[PDB]
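To whoever picks this up:

The nightly regression suite flagged Protein FLOWERING LOCUS T as changed. Nothing in the input moved, so I suspect the structure step. Input below, exactly as stored in the fixture:
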Amino acid sequence: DPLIVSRVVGDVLDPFNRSITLKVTYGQREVTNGLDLRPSQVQNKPRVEIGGEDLRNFYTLVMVDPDVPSPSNPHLREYLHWLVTDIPATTGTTFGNEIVSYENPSPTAGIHRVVFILFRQLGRQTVYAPGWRQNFNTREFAEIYNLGLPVAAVFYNSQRES
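Regenerated output under the current build:
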């Protein structure tokens, strides 16, 4: 399973059951696990569409790079690239609340995993932005905000361009 082989499950997430649709698209390129994207393709926020269990459900999207400054010494893990909450089922990020604005990943050292994680919320709720994007912890965030295990996750690989 790409999420296990890449250690996204492990480094960032506990094992979970995929249950909700998460589609992340940059330009005309849909992200699928492990595809390579160039930094020049990800300068602006992607389109994000989600599924859902019931139209009354709300979801939170987290985007992180766990490989900062480098995958071999990731002492700033995780870097928070984007956070959007209160996304109504079957819609997407433009219908949610943007807690932390999108910052484009632009790795310079090694291959970085760029991970999108979707969580089901118990209901709408207030979420606070961190004061720094470095040293974010998705597992701890999910615990604080009662988000449970992920319902979906996808990642791409990116490295410095040539």
